[PDB]
């Protein structure tokens, strides 16, 4: 294998604007109990569907992104339970060049 590296925290993420983010929600003992998800952003409903039959993740994908999607986000099953909270920060930043002296 290679080596990995893991930072915390890690609960807030920047992500660069016009890409597409995938959120993965996922509930792997009590999936067949809820048959719907939703992912909240910053306390209100951004996105619901049913959840999936076949596997215990659910998968929401959004973009390209802008400023509207820099929030706090947070994955909810209903028949209720939440997630923990995740932060997105989308930013423009260009490559820079750095010249040499």
């Known amino acids: ?3 990995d590296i893991t930072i915390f925290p890690n609960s807030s993420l ?4 016009g890409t597409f983010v995938t959120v993965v929600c996922s509930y792997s003992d009590k999936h067949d109990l809820y048959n719907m ?3 909240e952003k910053d306390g209100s409903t951004f ?6 039959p076949y596997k215990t993740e659910d998968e929401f994908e959004i973009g390209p992104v ?6 706090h986000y947070s994955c909810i099953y209903s028949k209720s339970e939440r997630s923990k909270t995740l932060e997105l920060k989308v930013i423009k930043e260009n490559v820079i060049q750095t ?3």
């Open 99 to 101: 010249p040499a002296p």
């Open 47 to 52: 996105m619901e569907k049913s959840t999936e």
């Open 66 to 71: 802008n400023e509207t999607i820099t929030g």
């Open 1 to 3: 294998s290679l080596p």
């Open 14 to 17: 920047m992500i660069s604007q």
């Open 37 to 39: 998800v939703r992912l």
